[PDB]
């Protein structure tokens, strides 16, 4: 139901890629204050905010990819398989806090099930226990910020703001932290790779706390040279900021510098808004509502909102493959052998295996790839129709102008 | 530069298919064609250079991660795999400059986007369009195909469809290169092709939101999403990429043509606008609007050793980008090293490129379009470190680059 505190976050791999020496051990010093506060606090949840390094985010490159999946695993970077265990999501925070963002016209993205790089569970792992599981649930808010045009800090900002009210409005009793890892100054790419200045760094730092509000105006190009190409990937704090409470106690403001990337930490307390806000919580529940409000007096209708995805995502996710020629291959040739190494329930192999199109509507398949499995089994959209409507096809036939078949 | 004008027209897999089985002759099929035939003619005289295309992807190229405006800044598209097989249809040109100028432009105007390249259209796309333009071995012309998330809600409000054709209209006139481009929405109108309701048409409503379209579209922008569903069945709600598309549009509009065919499931509609224009002086102006957008990457270029990661970059270096990106499939990087030539010979990769991946050569891949993360990936696999690459980088030694702390 509200924000307790929230930290920004280097998320150099160098975390990753070698710890998991005096040179890190007063770094973890940096690292003490955050790791203690993530115990005597208990969080339900971590609106987590990072950039994907091109791993799971390349071809296809967003702006704000919300994470809405139930688990998320490590990314293969080419290096392996980072050895930790799957985190646990919030979907049904996620499909709350969409509904919000979308109702202030917001643009999204929403994955599931795509791996997480060294810009998540890198400095993610240093900050909390991964023994056999992870101690929360996570809610990851992925950022396209490699590819230019990106948003503007003072849209980054907004949508932290947004996010501030969002949360608040989640009517379930819960305390959520946010994690915004970015930074700090440096840059990784050309001839001009080694740029760091701390005393942009320490300005930034100050600024982002006590005077957050003049930071919105900061082009692409003020943090360019300011603090290195990708460097810049601090908008990213803005948006945490932008969440968490106008006043913050900073119980934390650590910095130091070892090898290619600025390391530092700034870990804040929530207080409260410095108002009461211009849109209450009634009034704000209710209007991320309004346009599904009453869809469910729309009859033989199975809308496909966030929370019909999460359910059908491994049986989506499996008749998805029907695309590739070889899967829609071992599909017709052998199916049992193909579920047998699946991770579908039982249901699910009996849904696809019983051929039961209405059940899988029901179930949370959404009708296009019911449209590819019809086709792999040559066979017809309209089939497809008419035994949704317990109808025979001629039957059905009978309901259209014309009496038409394809695929 | 010049808007043309902007068609609408449904993107049912069942014009795809007549286009494919030749059903052009049949007493069923005919009039449908004879419907397009209007659109078709328009397109053949007035020629323009782009269409700034949008459209569903239906959980092909898009499902796992599924934004909402999707821009597609790609050099060409081809036909997706939809369980059957890639249709017959040759690949068409994208315009990346005109996709990087829109991107700009909307940026500033905070709309929140998504590019992309490579992967397939759909019968969003290509049913249409493999109706409407001679396809006998090329495309007449390019496209920037915006592909709008409407299959997984929340997606944004009808107004926000509307606010973004509004703002792509300025983004488009304010181009600054001299092309025509005509503009095109598609979806719809009524059908439910889901659940019990399957088969739930209403021309009703089909031929009123037409004429709204046409003549009052502002009036369309308060409908909800549970009122076009009730409407159109719930996936003629898609619908709402007509009005984007009508947004970039002239406030009003001349309708050259409408037809309808409602065959089966999906009423089967057809627009053309010929757009009137600037009757009405532009709100902002070209120059200002331009400004606002080049703005964040403002005075960028003097700083050296720095090569930024524009579209107009991802597109350069898209097929060493995503080849490298194959590092992550583990039987791919384990060919990468015991087979390297193999390799390379089973890519479409250019005798460049190759040779920049053979030298190890760090710096010229940052220069030719590479971003880093493809080599941090790419050193990691051969079982060398991350800091070399910066020690080439700066054109110094392990060692030597190791000095500055
Ligand atoms: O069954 C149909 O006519 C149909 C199928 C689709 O997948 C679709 O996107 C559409 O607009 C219509
Ligand atoms: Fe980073
Ligand atoms: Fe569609």
Redesign the interface.
Do not use: C
């Given at each position: 139901a509200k924000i307790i505190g929230g930290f920004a976050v280097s998320h150099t791999?160098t975390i990753a890629?070698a710890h998991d020496d005096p040179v890190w051990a007063p770094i973890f010093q940096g690292f003490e204050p955050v790791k203690q506060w993530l115990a005597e606090q208990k969080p339900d949840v971590t609106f987590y905010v990072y950039n994907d390094?091109?791993?799971?985010?390349?071809?296809?490159?967003?702006?704000?990819?919300l994470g809405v999946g139930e688990e998320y695993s490590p990314?293969?970077?080419?290096?392996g398989q980072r050895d930790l265990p799957p985190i646990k999501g919030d979907p049904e925070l996620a499909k709350h806090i969409?509904?919000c963002l979308?109702?202030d016209?917001?643009?999204?993205?929403?994955?599931?099930?795509?791996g997480l790089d060294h810009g998540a569970f890198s400095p993610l792992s240093v900050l909390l226990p991964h023994e056999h599981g992870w101690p929360c649930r996570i809610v990851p808010l992925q950022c396209?910020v490699?590819?230019?045009?990106?948003?503007?800090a003072?849209?980054f900002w907004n949508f932290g703001r947004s996010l501030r009210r969002a949360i608040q409005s989640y009517p379930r009793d819960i305390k959520v932290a946010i994690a915004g890892t970015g930074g700090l100054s440096h840059?990784?790419?050309?001839?001009?790779?080694?740029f760091n200045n701390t005393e942009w760094d320490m300005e930034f730092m100050e600024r982002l706390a006590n005077d957050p509000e003049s930071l919105l105006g900061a082009?692409?190009?003020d943090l360019?040279?300011k603090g290195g190409?990708?460097g810049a990937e601090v908008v990213m704090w803005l948006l945490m900021r932008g969440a968490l409470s106008p006043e913050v106690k900073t119980l934390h403001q650590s910095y130091f510098?070892?090898?290619?990337t600025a390391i530092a930490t700034m870990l804040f307390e929530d207080q409260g808004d410095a108002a009461p806000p211009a849109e209450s919580d009634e009034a704000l529940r209710a209007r991320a509502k309004?346009?599904?409000?009453?869809?469910e007096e729309?009859?033989?209708?199975?809308?496909?909102?966030?929370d019909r995805?999460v359910k059908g995502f491994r049986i989506?996710?499996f008749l998805?493959r029907?695309?590739?020629?070889d899967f829609?291959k071992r599909f017709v040739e052998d199916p049992e052998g193909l579920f047998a190494e699946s991770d579908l329930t039982e249901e699910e192999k009996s849904l696809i295996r019983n051929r039961d199109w209405?059940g899988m509507?029901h179930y949370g398949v959404?009708?296009?790839?019911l449209?590819?499995?019809?086709?792999?089994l040559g066979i017809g959209?309209?089939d497809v129709?008419a035994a949704?409507?317990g109808l025979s096809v001629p039957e059905?036939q009978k309901?259209?102008?014309?009496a038409?078949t394809?695929?």
């Open positions: 791999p890629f390094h091109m791993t799971s985010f390349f071809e296809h490159y967003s702006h704000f990819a990314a293969d970077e080419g290096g969409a509904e979308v109702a016209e917001f643009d999204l993205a929403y994955w599931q099930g795509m396209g490699l590819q230019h045009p990106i948003p503007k003072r849209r840059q990784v790419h050309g001839e001009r790779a080694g082009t692409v190009t360019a040279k190409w990708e510098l070892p090898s290619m309004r346009e599904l409000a009453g869809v729309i009859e033989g209708t199975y809308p496909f909102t966030i995805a989506n996710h998805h029907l695309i590739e020629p829609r209405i509507i959404i009708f296009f790839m449209e590819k499995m019809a086709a792999v959209n309209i129709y949704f409507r059905f309901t259209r102008n014309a038409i394809y695929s």
